[PDB]
């Protein structure tokens, strides 16, 4: 749920604007380099399969 | 508006298939409908298909 809020946040996903990573840090109280790590692991997670299978196909 | 143009020239070889239109010189049109194996063809006692 935090990796979702973190991802929906970095991108414009079902939200108006997208947020500067600092803007994001203050919003969770645990900040900085930190959120950028939470982010990367989440991407990292969505990157191989179980997960990877479906999204890949949108790329042509 | 046009800078340069590349024209590629293709040579297709079309055989023949159900649907092509054919005709003799006497106004007999007709469209080949099935293509038959030499096996199912009418032959004469000399064995030579048509």
């Amino acid at each position: 749920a935090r990796e979702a809020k973190v991802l929906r946040m970095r991108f414009g996903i079902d939200m108006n604007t997208d947020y500067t990573l600092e803007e994001v840090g203050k919003q969770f109280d645990v900040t900085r380099e930190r959120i950028r790590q939470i982010e990367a692991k989440a991407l990292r997670k969505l990157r191989h399969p179980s997960r990877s299978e479906v999204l890949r196909s949108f790329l042509d | 508006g046009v800078l340069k143009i590349v024209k590629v020239y293709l040579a297709v070889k079309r055989r023949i298939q159900p649907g092509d239109k054919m005709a003799g010189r006497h106004g007999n049109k007709g469209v080949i409908s099935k293509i038959n194996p030499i096996e199912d063809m009418p032959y004469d006692e000399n064995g030579t298909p048509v």
């Binding site: 990157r47 191989h48 399969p49 179980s50 990877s52 299978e53 890949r56 | 040579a11 055989r15 194996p37 030499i38 096996e39 032959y43 006692e45 000399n46 064995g47 030579t48 298909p49």
Partner: protein, 319 residues
Amino acid sequence: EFLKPRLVDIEQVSSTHAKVTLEPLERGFGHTLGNALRRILLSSMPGCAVTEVEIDGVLHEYSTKEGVQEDILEILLNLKGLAVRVQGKDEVILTLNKSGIGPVTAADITHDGDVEIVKPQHVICHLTDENASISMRIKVQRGRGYVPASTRIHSEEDERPIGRLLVDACYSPVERIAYNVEAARVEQRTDLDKLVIEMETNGTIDPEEAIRRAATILAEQLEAFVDLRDVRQPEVKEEKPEFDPILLRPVDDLELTVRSANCLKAEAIHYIGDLVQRTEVELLKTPNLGKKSLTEIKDVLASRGLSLGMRLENWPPAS
């Protein structure tokens, strides 16, 4: 409670055509086997037939050779009709050369242990300028019936040799078959019939050889006509792939350098399912792989979405 036939005089009359006879034939079985054999003999008979051809300085059929009077397209059409026989082999690549103002027959080729040029008068083309000169890789496979140039690209998988000019394949040796059952009176027995099956060949099948493979197939077919088990297939295939299907593709797909291409050839890594799970730890240790050599693998793996070095407690399942 029955009789059975067999073959008396197989009378050749030319290299091209002969009239084989079948004598112990009961009532009307003359027409029974006679039609049904015409039907297997006109189709299902083996043949080797020229398939692909590379020629010297020629890119495709729609061109002309300098100093020859046929147009390439025609010249392939002369080869469709190039009769030949080969034995132990299943695709031989003959070779042709010759120069000088001279009609190039099917003779002027080069022999092989297996190659028989059943018609070396057969015209392939004509040269027309003293030092006009031609060479070619004629390729001859062997198969059954009609395999036209067109259907031959689905395997594709790089037939890039652009100078390779596939011709349609009329793989056959029957030209026309024509049986007649004239009644033959074996001295005693009411009336049994003869079966003079007359045929017409390209020269490359020996009549008796034929007629046997013919009955051969007739047998193999009926073989399941005897019993009738209502047989079926299991079917119901799987709707569950575990991993992402990319891991079943070959490493060519990574569109990478040659040096790195063979590296994964050699270290045993075809499927990317194995390249994925082999770390950088595994790779300096691998034959001919450096800082330039492996920097290469982390860029294509990056752009397709995957990574080097990972796991899957399950690789690869399961047919």
